[PDB]
Amino acid sequence: VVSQYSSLLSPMSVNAVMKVIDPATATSVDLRDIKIVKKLGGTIDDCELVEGLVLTQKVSNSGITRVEKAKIGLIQFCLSAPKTDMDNQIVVSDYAQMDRVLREERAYILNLVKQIKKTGCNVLLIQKSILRDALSDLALHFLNKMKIMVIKDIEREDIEFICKTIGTKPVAHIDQFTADMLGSAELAEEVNLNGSGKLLKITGCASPGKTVTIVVRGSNKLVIEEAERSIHDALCVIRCLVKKRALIAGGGAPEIELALRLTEYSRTLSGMESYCVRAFADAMEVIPSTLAENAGLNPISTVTELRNRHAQGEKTAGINVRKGGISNILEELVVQPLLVSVSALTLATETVRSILKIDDVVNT
């Protein structure tokens, strides 16, 4: 469905794939390095390629939404009252112990926040915590009073992605929280999508290590789902090109060439196998027929013209929907990686062979 936007998505997909791999060394692409974020509203023309990190979590602070020259810190412990792993209670026997406990808890929280601030941190990411309040209200007040953006409820599964993106080493104890363990960035701000939600984008990092984020926007949810599926398909195609550096013509040319060559091969296989190979070639002759039928053309004449032209000697000849006939398909820039066709053939043949070995169905 995203064809009128292909002029925007194709360079975006190529840039996304190139930015997460090393072209001179990589033999495979890990698509988990390309995060796709779907936000309702706007139009697919508003899809953006974010070099940094995009977080859907909202800022707990109020009044602080834009920080320049940020020093993002990733925290895996809780900023609340002390609570050991062992079962613990505080026993009060005198009236002075009450406000002593209150004052000591306040001092503990203040010391934690001061230690965090001393490193120069100004943006704090707090990992999601259970069985213990990750961010106390008093802790949030102290953090706000020292001008630090606070983002909490960070998912555990996103820690690796965040560390890869902005170069922050996670901190689990306040003793090891130091400035050199933070992750510098050019800008970290929260933007609003024209009254359709808020996104936190950290764009510009000192160490942008092999990670990119893709923002997908659309009018309704169904078109957004289809757009992200299509973007994933484009990324997978570029991944195939990375794995196997081979290109083949499209528009039904490989299938027609395969049918012709396999017919010629079957003509030299006298026996009962010649019929089977001829049937294989005739079955491979189906994809161009389907392309011609969907294009609104006459499948018979179109397919026989393809076969005749391939027999002539030109193998880069396929369906030309734009022209409405048969011509050289490379002029239409319709190409696909060889891995797609090879895998399709191999997997389909293996599935058919497995099917042919079945002769009974038993209901358990």
Partner: protein, 130 residues
């Protein structure tokens, strides 16, 4: 059967965090130490999860479907009894094996620890397997 509402309708009493993802349920029961949750399904497998990290520590399959789970409180790792099959089975999660079995819905572990009730639809001494 008992499922508490979604929003918790409170004012951040540091208990609104509940996980309760329910990725497995017929015998969900919190353990002695709250860091682990034990749940069972109709596939005949008993699943142990760590509530903090949030992933399945190790699954237990030795049965048909399992119905009732009871845990003997000791580190939450010592033992837990399953009586889902007509086969009361006791597992140790320091080894992940069925330590002992009794081929005989509402199994209850006795507070003493030497026996456990096996109410179905008996006081089985663990020291004598009878």
């Amino acid at each position: 059967c008992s499922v508490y509402p979604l929003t918790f309708d409170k004012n951040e009493n540091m208990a609104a965090k509940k996980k309760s993802v329910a990725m497995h349920l017929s015998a969900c029961s919190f353990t002695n130490s709250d860091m682990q949750i034990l749940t069972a399904s109709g596939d005949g497998t008993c699943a142990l999860w760590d509530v903090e990290s949030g992933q399945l520590l190790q699954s237990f399959h030795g049965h048909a479907d399992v119905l009732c789970l009871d845990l003997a409180p000791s580190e939450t790792g010592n033992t837990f009894v399953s009586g889902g099959d007509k086969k009361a089975m006791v597992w140790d999660m320091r080894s992940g094996q069925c330590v002992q079995a009794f081929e005989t819905n509402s199994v209850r572990y006795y507070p003493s620890g030497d026996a456990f009730a096996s109410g179905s639809d008996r006081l089985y001494d663990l020291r004598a397997d009878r």
